[PDB]
Design an enzyme around this catalytic site. Structure first.
Site, PDB file in Angstrom:
ATOM      1  N   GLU A  89      -4.181  13.287   1.376  1.00 52.72           N
ATOM      2  CA  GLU A  89      -5.440  12.772   1.987  1.00 52.72           C
ATOM      3  C   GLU A  89      -6.231  13.942   2.557  1.00 52.72           C
ATOM      4  OE1 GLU A  89      -4.178   9.273   4.403  1.00 52.72           O
ATOM      5  OE2 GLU A  89      -4.995   8.265   2.629  1.00 52.72           O
ATOM      6  N   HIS A 144       5.165   7.175   6.807  1.00 51.41           N
ATOM      7  CA  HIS A 144       4.860   6.777   5.429  1.00 51.41           C
ATOM      8  C   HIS A 144       4.276   7.976   4.720  1.00 51.41           C
ATOM      9  CE1 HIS A 144       1.189   6.265   7.603  1.00 51.41           C
ATOM     10  NE2 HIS A 144       0.657   6.770   6.496  1.00 51.41           N
ATOM     11  N   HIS A 164       2.850  11.114   6.855  1.00 48.95           N
ATOM     12  CA  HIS A 164       2.215  10.768   8.147  1.00 48.95           C
ATOM     13  C   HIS A 164       3.324  10.260   9.080  1.00 48.95           C
ATOM     14  CE1 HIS A 164      -1.910  10.477   6.142  1.00 48.95           C
ATOM     15  NE2 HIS A 164      -1.570  11.742   6.434  1.00 48.95           N
ATOM     16  N   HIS A 204       1.472   9.208   1.341  1.00 47.40           N
ATOM     17  CA  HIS A 204       0.403   9.023   0.331  1.00 47.40           C
ATOM     18  C   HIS A 204       0.706   9.951  -0.840  1.00 47.40           C
ATOM     19  CE1 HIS A 204      -2.069   6.976   3.456  1.00 47.40           C
ATOM     20  NE2 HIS A 204      -1.323   7.823   4.191  1.00 47.40           N
ATOM     21  N   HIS A 242       0.855  -1.233   0.000  1.00 47.15           N
ATOM     22  CA  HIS A 242       0.000   0.000   0.000  1.00 47.15           C
ATOM     23  C   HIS A 242       0.875   1.262   0.000  1.00 47.15           C
ATOM     24  CE1 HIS A 242      -3.217  -2.763   0.797  1.00 47.15           C
ATOM     25  NE2 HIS A 242      -2.574  -3.199   1.901  1.00 47.15           N
ATOM     26  N   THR A 268      -6.419   6.139   8.199  1.00 45.10           N
ATOM     27  CA  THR A 268      -6.967   6.410   6.841  1.00 45.10           C
ATOM     28  C   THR A 268      -6.906   5.133   6.007  1.00 45.10           C
ATOM     29  OG1 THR A 268      -4.943   7.168   5.828  1.00 45.10           O
ATOM     30  CG2 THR A 268      -6.338   8.844   6.968  1.00 45.10           C
TER      31      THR A 268
END
Ligand SMILES: C[C@@]12CC[C@@H]3C(=C1CC[C@H](OS(N)(=O)=O)C2)CC[C@@H]1CC(=O)C[C@]13C
Ligand SMILES: [Zn+2]
Length: 258
Positions: A104, A92, A117, A94, A62, A196
């Protein structure tokens, strides 16, 4: 048929396995800067990462996770909206397929190219697994990325991604200093919300910094070369691993700044 970010297993599907997906305190959210109330009672954030001990970087199918040794009180977040002390366990990102999406959280509906994050757990619950069962178990520090100047403090991360291209690959990743990922200002927004990704647990105090960091187009292009799939499977680029804004419902976003 596990969760992911595709047409058939992406965020609009998660509620089937994780009904909390339609819950009262889901993340991320749109931050409406005009509605966020300045809260003069909020304290300055305390980010104490001088002793942070990174151990490893991992492609989990992911995202990629930079993991820390959280066996001692070293890398801690406190103050801001928090009671007590929260220990850094991993960070990590996104990111998008294009620079116009990937964050996000949004700010007045603006999407950033990416979002970092830094995940911390409340030491009063003893470990991460027990903390995620508590409404005040986690503090996630969210930092926006925009494309412009390189972030020199990110380059050690970008340079190891070739070694973890596919799901399940990990690499030793010691002596990484997460202070090099922070913007100048610690002005923030804060609200109660969730993880999330599945399991979407409603255990997070979100602290989202107003000031983005700049990363280069070359840096974010190397994020986009990662793979969601495992070694020897059909290539699916790891892009658009972001959950869209969820309903704010009965929640107040508070600003640390005027
Ligand atoms: C913290 C993260 C990634 C690291 C990972 C876990 C999550 C849960 C989802 C969070 O995403 S988000 N976007 O809400 O911050 C990020 C689940 C449990 C895993 C056990 C492990 O070995 C690594 C752990 C802690
Ligand atoms: Zn995240």
């Amino acid at each position: 048929h596990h969760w992911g970010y595709g047409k058939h297993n992406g965020p609009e599907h998660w509620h089937k396995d994780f009904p909390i997906a339609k819950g009262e305190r889901q993340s991320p959210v749109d931050i409406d800067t005009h509605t966020a109330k300045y809260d003069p009672s909020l304290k300055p954030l305390s980010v104490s990462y001088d002793q942070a001990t990174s151990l490893r970087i991992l492609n989990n199918g992911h995202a990629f996770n930079v993991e820390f040794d959280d066996s001692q009180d070293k890398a801690v977040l406190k103050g801001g909206p928090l009671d007590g002390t929260y220990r850094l366990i991993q960070f990590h990102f996104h990111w998008g397929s294009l620079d116009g999406q990937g964050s996000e959280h949004t700010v007045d509906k603006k999407k950033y190219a990416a979002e970092l994050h830094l995940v911390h757990w409340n030491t009063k619950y003893g470990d991460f697994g027990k903390a995620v069962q508590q409404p005040d178990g986690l503090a996630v520090l969210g930092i926006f990325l925009k494309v412009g100047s390189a972030k020199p403090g990110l380059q050690k991360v970008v340079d190891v991604l070739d070694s973890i291209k596919t799901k399940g690959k990990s690499a030793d990743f010691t002596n990484f200093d997460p202070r090099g990922l922070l913007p100048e200002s610690l002005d923030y927004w804060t609200y109660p919300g969730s993880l999330t990704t599945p399991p979407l647990l409603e255990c997070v105090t979100w602290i989202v910094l107003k000031e983005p960091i700049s990363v280069s187009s070359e840096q974010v292009l190397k994020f986009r070369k990662l793979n969601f799939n495992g070694e020897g499977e059909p290539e699916e680029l790891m892009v658009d691993n972001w959950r869209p804004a969820q309903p704010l419902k009965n929640r107040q976003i508070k600003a640390s700044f005027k």
